[PDB]
Short mmCIF file of C-alpha atoms and ligand atoms in Angstrom, two decimals:
data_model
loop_
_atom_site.label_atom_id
_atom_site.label_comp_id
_atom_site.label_asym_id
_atom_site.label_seq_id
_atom_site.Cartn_x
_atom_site.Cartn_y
_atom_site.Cartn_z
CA UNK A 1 161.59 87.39 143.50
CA UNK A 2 165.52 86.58 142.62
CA UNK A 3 164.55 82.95 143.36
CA UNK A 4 161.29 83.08 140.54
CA UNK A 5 158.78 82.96 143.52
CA UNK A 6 156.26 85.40 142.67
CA UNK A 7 153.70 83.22 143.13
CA UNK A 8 149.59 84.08 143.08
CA UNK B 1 135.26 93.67 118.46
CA UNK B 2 133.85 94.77 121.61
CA UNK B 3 132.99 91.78 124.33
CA UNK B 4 131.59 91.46 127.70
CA UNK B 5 128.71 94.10 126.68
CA UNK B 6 124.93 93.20 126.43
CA UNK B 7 121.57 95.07 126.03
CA UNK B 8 119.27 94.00 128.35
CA UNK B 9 115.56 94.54 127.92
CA UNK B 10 114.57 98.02 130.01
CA UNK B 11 114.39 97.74 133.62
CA UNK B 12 114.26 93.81 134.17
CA UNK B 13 115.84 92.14 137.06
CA UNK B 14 118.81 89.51 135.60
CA UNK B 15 120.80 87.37 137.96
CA UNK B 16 124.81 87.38 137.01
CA UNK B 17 127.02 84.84 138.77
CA UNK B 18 130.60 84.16 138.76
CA UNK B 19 132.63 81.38 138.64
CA UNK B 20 136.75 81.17 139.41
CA UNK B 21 138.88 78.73 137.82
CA UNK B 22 142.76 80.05 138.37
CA UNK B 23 145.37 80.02 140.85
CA UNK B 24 145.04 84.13 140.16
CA UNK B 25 142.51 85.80 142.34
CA UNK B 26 139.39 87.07 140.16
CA UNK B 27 137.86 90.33 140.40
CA UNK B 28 134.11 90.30 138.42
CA UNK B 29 132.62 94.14 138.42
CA UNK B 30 129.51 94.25 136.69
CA UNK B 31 128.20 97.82 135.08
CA UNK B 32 124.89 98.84 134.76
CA UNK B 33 124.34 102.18 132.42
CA UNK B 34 127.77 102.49 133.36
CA UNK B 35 127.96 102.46 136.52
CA UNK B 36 129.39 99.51 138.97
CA UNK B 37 126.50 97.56 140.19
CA UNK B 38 128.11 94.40 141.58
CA UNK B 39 132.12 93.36 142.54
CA UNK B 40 132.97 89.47 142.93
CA UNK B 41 135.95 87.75 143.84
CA UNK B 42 137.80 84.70 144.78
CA UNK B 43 140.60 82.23 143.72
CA UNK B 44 139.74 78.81 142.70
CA UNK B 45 140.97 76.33 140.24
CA UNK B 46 137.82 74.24 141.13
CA UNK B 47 134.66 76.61 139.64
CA UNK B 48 134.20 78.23 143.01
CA UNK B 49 130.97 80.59 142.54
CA UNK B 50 132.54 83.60 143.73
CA UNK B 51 129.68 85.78 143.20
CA UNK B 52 126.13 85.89 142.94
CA UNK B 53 123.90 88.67 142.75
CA UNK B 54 120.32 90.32 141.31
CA UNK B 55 120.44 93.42 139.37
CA UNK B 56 117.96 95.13 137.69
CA UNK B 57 118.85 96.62 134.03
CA UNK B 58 117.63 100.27 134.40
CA UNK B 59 116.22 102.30 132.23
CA UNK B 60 118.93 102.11 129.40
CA UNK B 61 119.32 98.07 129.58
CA UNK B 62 123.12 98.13 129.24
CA UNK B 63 125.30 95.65 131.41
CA UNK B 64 128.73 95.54 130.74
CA UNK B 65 131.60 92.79 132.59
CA UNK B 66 134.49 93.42 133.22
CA UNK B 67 137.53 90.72 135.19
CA UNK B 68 141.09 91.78 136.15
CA UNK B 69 143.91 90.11 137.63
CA UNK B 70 145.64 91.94 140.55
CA UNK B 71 145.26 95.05 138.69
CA UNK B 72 145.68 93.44 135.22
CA UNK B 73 142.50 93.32 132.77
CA UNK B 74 141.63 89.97 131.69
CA UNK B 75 140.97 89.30 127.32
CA UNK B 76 137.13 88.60 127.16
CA UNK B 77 134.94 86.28 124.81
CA UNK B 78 131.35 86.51 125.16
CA UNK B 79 127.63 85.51 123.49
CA UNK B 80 124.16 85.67 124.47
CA UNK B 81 121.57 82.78 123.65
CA UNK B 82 117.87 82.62 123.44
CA UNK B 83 116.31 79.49 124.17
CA UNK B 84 112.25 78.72 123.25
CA UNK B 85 112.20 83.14 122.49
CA UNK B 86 112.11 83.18 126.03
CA UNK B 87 115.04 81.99 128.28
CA UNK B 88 117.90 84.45 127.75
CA UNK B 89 121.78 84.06 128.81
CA UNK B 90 124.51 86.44 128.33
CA UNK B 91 127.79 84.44 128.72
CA UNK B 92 131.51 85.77 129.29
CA UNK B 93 134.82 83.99 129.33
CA UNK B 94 138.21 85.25 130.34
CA UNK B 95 141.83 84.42 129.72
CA UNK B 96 144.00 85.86 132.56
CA UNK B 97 147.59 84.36 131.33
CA UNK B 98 148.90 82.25 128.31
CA UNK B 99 147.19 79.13 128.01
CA UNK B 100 144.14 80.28 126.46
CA UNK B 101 141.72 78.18 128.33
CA UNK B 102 139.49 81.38 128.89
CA UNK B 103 137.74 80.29 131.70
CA UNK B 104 139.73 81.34 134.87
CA UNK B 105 136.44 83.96 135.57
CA UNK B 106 133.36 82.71 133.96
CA UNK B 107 130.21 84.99 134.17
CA UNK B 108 126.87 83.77 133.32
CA UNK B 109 123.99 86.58 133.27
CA UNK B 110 120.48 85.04 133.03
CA UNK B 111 116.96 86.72 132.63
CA UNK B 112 113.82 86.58 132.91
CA UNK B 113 113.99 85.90 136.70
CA UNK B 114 110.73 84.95 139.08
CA UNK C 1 114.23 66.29 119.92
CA UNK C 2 115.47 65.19 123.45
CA UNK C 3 116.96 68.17 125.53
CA UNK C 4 119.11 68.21 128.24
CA UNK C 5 121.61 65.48 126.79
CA UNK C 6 124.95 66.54 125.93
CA UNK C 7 128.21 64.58 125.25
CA UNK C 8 131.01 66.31 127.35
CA UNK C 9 134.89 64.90 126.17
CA UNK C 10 135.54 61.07 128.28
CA UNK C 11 136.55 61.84 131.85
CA UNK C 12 136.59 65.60 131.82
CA UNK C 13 135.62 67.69 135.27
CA UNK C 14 132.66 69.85 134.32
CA UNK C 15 131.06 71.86 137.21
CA UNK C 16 127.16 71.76 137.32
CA UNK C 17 125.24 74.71 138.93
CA UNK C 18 121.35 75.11 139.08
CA UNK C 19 119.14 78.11 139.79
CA UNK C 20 115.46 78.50 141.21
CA UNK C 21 112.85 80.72 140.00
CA UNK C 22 109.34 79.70 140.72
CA UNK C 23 106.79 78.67 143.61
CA UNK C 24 107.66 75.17 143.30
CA UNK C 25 110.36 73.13 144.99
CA UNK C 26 112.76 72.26 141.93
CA UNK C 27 114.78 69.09 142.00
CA UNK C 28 117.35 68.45 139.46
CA UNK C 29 119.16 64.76 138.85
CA UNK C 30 122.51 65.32 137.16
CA UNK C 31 122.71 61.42 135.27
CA UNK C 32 126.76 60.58 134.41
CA UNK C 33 126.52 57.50 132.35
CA UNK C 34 123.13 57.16 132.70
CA UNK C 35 123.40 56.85 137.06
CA UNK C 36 122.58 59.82 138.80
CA UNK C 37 125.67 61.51 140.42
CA UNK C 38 124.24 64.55 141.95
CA UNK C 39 120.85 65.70 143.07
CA UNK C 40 120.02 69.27 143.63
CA UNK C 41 116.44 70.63 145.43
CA UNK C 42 115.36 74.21 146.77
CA UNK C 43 112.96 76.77 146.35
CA UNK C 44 113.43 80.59 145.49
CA UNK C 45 111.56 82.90 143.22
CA UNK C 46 115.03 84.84 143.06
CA UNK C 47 117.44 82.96 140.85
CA UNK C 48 118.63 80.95 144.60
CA UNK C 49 121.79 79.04 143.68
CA UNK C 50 119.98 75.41 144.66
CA UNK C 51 123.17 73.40 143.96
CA UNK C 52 126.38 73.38 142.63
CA UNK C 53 129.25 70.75 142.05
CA UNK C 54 132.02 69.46 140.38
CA UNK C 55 131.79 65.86 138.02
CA UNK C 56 133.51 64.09 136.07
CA UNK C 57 132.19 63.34 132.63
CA UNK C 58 133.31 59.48 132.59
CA UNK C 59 134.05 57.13 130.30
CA UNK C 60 131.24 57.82 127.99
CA UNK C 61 131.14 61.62 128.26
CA UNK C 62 127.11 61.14 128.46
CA UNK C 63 125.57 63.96 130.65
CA UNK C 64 121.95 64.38 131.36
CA UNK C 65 120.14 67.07 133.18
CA UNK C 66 116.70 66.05 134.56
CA UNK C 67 113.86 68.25 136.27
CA UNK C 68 111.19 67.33 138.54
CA UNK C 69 108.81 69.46 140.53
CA UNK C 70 106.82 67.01 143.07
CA UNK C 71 107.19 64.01 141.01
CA UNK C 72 106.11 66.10 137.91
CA UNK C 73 108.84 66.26 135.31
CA UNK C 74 109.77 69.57 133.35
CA UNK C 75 109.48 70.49 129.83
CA UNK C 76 113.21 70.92 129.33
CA UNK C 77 115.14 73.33 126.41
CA UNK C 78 119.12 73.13 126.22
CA UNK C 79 121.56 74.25 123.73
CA UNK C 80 125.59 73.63 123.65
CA UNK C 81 127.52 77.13 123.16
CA UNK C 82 131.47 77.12 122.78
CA UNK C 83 133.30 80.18 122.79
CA UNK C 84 136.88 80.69 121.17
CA UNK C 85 136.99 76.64 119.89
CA UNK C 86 138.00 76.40 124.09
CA UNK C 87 135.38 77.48 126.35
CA UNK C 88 132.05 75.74 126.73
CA UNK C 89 128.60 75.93 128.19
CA UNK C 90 125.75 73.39 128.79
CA UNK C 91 122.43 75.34 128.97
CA UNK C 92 119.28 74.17 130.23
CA UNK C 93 116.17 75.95 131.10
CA UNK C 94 112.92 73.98 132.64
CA UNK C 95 109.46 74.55 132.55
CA UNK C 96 107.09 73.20 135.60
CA UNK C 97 103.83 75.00 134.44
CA UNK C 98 101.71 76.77 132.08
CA UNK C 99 103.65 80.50 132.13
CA UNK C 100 106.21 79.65 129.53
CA UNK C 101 108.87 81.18 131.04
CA UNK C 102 111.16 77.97 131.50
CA UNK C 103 113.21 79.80 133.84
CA UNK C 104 111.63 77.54 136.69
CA UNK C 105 114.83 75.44 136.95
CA UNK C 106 118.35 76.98 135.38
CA UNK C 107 121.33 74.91 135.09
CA UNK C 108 124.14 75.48 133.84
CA UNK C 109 127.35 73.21 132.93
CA UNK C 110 130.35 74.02 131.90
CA UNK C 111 134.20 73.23 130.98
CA UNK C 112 136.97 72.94 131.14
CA UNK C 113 137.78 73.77 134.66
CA UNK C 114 141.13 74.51 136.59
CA UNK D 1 108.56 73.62 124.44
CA UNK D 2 107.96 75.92 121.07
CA UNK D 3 110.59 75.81 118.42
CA UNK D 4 110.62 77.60 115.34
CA UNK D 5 109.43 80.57 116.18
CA UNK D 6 111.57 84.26 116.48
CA UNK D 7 110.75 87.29 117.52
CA UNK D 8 112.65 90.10 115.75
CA UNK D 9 112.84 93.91 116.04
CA UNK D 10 109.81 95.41 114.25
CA UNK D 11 110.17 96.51 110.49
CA UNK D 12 113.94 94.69 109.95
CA UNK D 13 114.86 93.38 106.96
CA UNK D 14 116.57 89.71 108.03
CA UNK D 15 117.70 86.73 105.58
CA UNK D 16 116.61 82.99 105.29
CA UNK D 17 118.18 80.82 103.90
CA UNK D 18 117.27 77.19 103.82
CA UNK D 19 119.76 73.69 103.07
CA UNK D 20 118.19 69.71 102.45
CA UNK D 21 120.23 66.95 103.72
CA UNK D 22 117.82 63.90 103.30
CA UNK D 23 116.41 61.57 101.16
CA UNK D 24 112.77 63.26 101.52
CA UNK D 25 111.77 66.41 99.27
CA UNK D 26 112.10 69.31 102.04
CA UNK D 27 108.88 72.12 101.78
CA UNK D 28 110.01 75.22 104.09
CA UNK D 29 107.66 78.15 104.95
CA UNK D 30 108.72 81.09 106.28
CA UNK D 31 105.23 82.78 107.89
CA UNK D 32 106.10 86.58 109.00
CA UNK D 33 102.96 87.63 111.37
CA UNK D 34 101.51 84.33 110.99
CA UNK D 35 101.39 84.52 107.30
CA UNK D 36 103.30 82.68 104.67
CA UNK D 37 106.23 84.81 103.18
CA UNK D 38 108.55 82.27 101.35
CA UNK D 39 108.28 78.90 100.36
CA UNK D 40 111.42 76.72 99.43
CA UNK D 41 111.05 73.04 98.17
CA UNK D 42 113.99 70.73 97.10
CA UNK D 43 116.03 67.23 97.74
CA UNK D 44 119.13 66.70 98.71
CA UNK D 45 121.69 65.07 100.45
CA UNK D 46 124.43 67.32 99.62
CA UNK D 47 123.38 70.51 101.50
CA UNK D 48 121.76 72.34 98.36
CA UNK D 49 120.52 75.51 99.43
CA UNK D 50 116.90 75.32 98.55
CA UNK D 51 116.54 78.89 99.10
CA UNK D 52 117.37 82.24 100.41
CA UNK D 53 115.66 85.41 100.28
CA UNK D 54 115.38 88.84 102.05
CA UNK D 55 112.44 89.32 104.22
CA UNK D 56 111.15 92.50 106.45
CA UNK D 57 110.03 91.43 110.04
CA UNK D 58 106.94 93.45 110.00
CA UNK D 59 104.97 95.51 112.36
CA UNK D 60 104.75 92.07 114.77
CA UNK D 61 108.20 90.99 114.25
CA UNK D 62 106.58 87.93 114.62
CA UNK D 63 108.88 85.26 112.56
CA UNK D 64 107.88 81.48 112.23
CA UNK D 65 109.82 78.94 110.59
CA UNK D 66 107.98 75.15 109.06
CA UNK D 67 109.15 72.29 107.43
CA UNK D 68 107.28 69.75 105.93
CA UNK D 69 107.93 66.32 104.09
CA UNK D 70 104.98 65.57 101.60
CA UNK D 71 102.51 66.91 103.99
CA UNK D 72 103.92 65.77 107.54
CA UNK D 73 105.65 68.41 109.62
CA UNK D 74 109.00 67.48 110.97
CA UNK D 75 110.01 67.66 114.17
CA UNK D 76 112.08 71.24 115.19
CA UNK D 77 114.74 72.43 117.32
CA UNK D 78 116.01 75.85 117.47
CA UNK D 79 117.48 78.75 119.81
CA UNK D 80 118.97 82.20 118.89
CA UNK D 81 122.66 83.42 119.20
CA UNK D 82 124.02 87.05 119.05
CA UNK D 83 127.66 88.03 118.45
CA UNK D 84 129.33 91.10 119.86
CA UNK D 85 125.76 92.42 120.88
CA UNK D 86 124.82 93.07 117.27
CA UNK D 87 125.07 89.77 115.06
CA UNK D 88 122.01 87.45 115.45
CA UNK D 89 121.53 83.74 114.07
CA UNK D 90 118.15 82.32 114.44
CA UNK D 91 118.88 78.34 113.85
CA UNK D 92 116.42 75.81 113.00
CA UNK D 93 117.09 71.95 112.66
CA UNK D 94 114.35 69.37 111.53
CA UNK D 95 114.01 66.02 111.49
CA UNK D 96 111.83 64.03 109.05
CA UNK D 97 112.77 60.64 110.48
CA UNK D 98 113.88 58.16 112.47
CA UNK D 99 117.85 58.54 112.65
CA UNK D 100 117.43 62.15 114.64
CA UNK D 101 120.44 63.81 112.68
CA UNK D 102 118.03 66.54 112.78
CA UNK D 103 119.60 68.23 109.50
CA UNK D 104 117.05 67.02 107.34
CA UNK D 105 116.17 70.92 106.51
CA UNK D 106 118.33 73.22 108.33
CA UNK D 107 117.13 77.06 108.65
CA UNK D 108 119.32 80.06 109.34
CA UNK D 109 117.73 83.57 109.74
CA UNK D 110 120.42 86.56 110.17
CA UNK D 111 120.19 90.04 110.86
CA UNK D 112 120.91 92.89 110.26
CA UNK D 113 121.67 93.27 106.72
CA UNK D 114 122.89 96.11 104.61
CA UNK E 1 140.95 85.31 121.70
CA UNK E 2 141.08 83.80 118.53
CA UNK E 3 138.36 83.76 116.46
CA UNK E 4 136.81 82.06 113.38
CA UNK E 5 138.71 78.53 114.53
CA UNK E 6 136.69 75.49 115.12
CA UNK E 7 137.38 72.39 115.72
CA UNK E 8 135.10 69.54 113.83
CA UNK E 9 135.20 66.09 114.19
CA UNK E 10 138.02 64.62 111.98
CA UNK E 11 137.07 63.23 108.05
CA UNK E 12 133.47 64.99 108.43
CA UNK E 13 131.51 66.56 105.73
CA UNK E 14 130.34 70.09 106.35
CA UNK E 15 128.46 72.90 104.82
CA UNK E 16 130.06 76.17 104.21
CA UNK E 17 128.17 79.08 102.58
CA UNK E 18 129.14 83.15 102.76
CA UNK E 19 126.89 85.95 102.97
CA UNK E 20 127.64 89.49 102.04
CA UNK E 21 126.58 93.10 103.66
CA UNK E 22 128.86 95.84 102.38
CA UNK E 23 129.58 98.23 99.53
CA UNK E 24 133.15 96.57 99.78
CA UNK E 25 133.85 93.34 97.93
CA UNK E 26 134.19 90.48 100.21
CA UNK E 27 136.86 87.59 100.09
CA UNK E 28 136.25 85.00 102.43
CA UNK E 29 138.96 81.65 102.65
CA UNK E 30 137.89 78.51 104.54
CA UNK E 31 141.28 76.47 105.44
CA UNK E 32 141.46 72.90 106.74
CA UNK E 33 144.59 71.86 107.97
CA UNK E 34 146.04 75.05 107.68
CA UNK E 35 145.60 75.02 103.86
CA UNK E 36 143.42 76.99 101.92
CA UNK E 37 140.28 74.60 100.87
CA UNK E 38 137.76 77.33 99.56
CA UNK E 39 137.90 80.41 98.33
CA UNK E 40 134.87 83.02 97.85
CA UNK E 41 134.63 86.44 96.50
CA UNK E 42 131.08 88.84 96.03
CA UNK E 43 129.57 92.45 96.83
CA UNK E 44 126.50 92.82 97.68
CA UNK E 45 124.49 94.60 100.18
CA UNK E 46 121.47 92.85 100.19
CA UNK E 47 122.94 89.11 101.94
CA UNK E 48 123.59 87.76 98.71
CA UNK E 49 124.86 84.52 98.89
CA UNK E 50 128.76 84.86 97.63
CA UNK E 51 129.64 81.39 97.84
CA UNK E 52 128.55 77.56 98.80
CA UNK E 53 130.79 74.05 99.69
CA UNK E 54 130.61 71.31 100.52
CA UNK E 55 134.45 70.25 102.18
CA UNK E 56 136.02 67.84 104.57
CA UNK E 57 137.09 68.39 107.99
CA UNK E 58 140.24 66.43 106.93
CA UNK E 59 143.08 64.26 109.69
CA UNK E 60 142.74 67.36 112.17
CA UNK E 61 139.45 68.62 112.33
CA UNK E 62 140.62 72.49 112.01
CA UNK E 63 138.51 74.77 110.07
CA UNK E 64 139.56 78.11 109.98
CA UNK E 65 137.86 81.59 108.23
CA UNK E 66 139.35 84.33 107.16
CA UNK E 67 137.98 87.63 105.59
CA UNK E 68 139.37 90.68 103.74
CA UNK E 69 138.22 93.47 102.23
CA UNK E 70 140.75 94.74 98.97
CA UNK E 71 143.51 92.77 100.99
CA UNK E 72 142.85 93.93 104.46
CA UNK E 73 141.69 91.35 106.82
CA UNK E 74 138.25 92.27 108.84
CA UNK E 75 138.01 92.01 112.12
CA UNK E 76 136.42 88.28 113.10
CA UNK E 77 133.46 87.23 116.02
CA UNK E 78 132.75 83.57 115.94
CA UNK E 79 131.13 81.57 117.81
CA UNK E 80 129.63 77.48 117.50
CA UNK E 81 126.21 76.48 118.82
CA UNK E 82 124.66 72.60 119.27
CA UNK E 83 120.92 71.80 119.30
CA UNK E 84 119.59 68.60 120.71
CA UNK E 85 123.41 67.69 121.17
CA UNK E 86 123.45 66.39 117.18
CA UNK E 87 123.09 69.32 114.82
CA UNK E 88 126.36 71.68 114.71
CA UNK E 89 126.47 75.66 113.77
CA UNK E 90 129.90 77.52 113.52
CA UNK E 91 129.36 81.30 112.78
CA UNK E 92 131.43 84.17 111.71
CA UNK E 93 130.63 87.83 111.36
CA UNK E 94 133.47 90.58 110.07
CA UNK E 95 133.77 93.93 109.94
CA UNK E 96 135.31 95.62 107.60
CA UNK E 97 134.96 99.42 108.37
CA UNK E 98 133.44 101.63 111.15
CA UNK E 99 130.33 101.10 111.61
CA UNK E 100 130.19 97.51 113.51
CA UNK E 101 127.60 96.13 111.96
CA UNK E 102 129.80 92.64 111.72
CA UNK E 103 127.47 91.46 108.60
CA UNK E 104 129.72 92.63 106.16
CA UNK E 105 130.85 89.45 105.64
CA UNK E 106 128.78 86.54 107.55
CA UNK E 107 129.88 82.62 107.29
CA UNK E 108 127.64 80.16 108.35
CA UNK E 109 129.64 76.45 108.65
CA UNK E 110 127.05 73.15 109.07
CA UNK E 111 127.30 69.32 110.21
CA UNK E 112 126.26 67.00 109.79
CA UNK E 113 125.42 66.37 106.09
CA UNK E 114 123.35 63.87 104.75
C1 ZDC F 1 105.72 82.07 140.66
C2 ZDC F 1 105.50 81.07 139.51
O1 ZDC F 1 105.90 79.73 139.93
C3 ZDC F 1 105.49 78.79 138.92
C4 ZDC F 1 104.07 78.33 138.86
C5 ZDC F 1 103.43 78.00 140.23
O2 ZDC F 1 102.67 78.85 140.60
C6 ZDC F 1 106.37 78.98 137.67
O3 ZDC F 1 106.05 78.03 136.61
C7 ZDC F 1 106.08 80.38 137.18
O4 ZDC F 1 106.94 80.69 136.04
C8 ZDC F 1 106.31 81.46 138.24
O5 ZDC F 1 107.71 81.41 138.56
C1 ZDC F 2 119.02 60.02 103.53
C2 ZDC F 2 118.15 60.02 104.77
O1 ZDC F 2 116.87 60.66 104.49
C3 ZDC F 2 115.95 60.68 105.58
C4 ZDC F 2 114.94 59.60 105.80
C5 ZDC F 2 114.34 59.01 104.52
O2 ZDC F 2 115.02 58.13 104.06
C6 ZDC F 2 116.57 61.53 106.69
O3 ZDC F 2 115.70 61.52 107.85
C7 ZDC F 2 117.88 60.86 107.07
O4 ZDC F 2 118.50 61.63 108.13
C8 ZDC F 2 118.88 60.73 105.93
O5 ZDC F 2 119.28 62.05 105.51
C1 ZDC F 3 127.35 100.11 103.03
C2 ZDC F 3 128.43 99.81 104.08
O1 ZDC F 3 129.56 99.06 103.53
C3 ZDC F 3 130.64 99.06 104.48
C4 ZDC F 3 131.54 100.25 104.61
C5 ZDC F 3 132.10 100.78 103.28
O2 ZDC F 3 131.57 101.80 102.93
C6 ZDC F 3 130.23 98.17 105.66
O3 ZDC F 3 131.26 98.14 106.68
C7 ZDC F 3 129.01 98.84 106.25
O4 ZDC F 3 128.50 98.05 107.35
C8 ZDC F 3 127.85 99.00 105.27
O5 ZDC F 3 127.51 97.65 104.86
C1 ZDC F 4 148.62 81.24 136.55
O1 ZDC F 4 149.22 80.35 137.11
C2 ZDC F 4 147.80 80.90 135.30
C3 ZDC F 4 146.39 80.58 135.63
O2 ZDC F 4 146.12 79.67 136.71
C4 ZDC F 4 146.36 78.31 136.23
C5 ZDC F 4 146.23 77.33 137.37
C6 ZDC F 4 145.39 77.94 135.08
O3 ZDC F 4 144.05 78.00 135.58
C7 ZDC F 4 145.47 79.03 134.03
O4 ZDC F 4 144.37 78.79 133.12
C8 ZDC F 4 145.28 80.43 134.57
O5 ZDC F 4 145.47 81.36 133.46
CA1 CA F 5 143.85 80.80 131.65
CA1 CA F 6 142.08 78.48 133.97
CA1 CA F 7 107.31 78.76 134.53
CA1 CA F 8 109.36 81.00 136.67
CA1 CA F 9 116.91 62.72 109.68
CA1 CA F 10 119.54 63.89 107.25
CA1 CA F 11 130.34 97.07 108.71
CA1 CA F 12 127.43 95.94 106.65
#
């Protein structure tokens, strides 16, 4: 979630 | 104003049905005199009918949907037609994130049934 | 006035979704551009999901809903609802006898998807 | 299947109002438990609103709409949409013709007032 | 979602006319393009017909309604309904107070004309 991968 | 909410003739059997279009997982619950009657869910950004289910209205009529998001309730826009006096729908949109295409849970309520 | 017709936007996915509610076997054409492109049939006095499917509205946008019950066609009733200038439904209820319920055959269209 | 034709909640005042877009003098009855309540005549392609008035639905809550071009009814299409669960529209197109723009005399019945 | 936002066909004609339910004075503004076309202004509790236009869709398309009450915007359901995939209705209730009636102010937009 550092890397903007908080994905659905 | 107040969406998602529709009064339902007394004690009549309505179908509602659910349809997913969002790479968010839907939840659909469905109230009846305020009480949850009916849960759907699913993820698809292809209509996917998540849910589909029979009810009946009760004594006091009211049905109310509600969607969330993992947690997060979804904005709602709703209507109900009549078609011929006779052929009733109560339909509900929903916008889970920014692009306003409210239609990532669609819920379509139909009666008279049979 | 003819029912059942409605002019989606050119080459637009729309899913198409039909429910049963009578004695009769219901079978419902979905014409794109005037050539059939999907063909639902079942049975169920319960609201039955009979079919449903993804299209594509085509170059024309033309889509037409027809209902048949043993080679008899339905009395058809339709009506175009859009919901927050985004969200929008194709309605169609069917009637295959003398009852006037025209709940027989219920399909419903709608867009966008995804 | 039947167009025209409404069935409100008992004893409720609703309004009518009635607009001419053809060439052809528009006659529109209103007929509240099958008898004739308000008349409105007029021409116009401009949308003139031919009339309005304030009606009470009556014990029946029986409401029927007509429209008529020297004599010959035109043909009607209708259905019946409520807003947040509270708003209703009864709609009514006509068409006197041949070019099915079916606004020829155009019918809109809303309730509740006050 | 946004309400009281539709989106016509460009360079059309349509019908605009405003009803009014409430002890408060109703304003009503009908912009195309983002610019204020049409202005109306009436009490009445009785459906009174406050205003009447005739306007053009203009380059876009976007007609927008607005309401207020003694400079405070009501609260806005909308919604647009086809028949017989010809004849166009865009609606708008507001509320203006408490009691969630949405009449106070009711808009009623039309096309074709002619
Ligand atoms: C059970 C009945 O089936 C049909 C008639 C035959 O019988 C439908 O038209 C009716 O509305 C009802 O669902
Ligand atoms: C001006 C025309 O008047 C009629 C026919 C006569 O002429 C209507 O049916 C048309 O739609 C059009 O408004
Ligand atoms: C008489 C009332 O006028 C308003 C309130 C003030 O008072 C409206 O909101 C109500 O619905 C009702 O029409
Ligand atoms: C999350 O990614 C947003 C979400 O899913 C998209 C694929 C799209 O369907 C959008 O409308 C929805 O809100
Ligand atoms: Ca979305
Ligand atoms: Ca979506
Ligand atoms: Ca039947
Ligand atoms: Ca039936
Ligand atoms: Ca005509
Ligand atoms: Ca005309
Ligand atoms: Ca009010
Ligand atoms: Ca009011």
């Amino acid at each position: 979630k550092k890397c903007k991968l908080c994905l659905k | 104003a107040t969406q998602g909410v529709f009064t339902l003739p007394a004690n009549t059997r309505f179908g509602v049905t659910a349809f997913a279009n969002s790479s968010g997982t839907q939840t659909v619950n469905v109230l009846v005199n305020n009480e949850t009657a009916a849960t759907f869910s699913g993820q698809s950004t292809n209509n996917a009918v998540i849910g589909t289910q029979v009810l009946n209205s009760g004594s006091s009529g009211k049905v109310q949907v509600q969607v969330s998001v993992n947690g997060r309730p979804s904005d709602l826009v709703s209507a109900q037609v009549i078609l011929t006096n006779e052929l009733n729908f109560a339909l509900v949109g929903s916008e889970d994130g920014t692009d306003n295409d409210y239609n990532d849970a669609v819920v379509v309520i139909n009666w008279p049934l049979g």
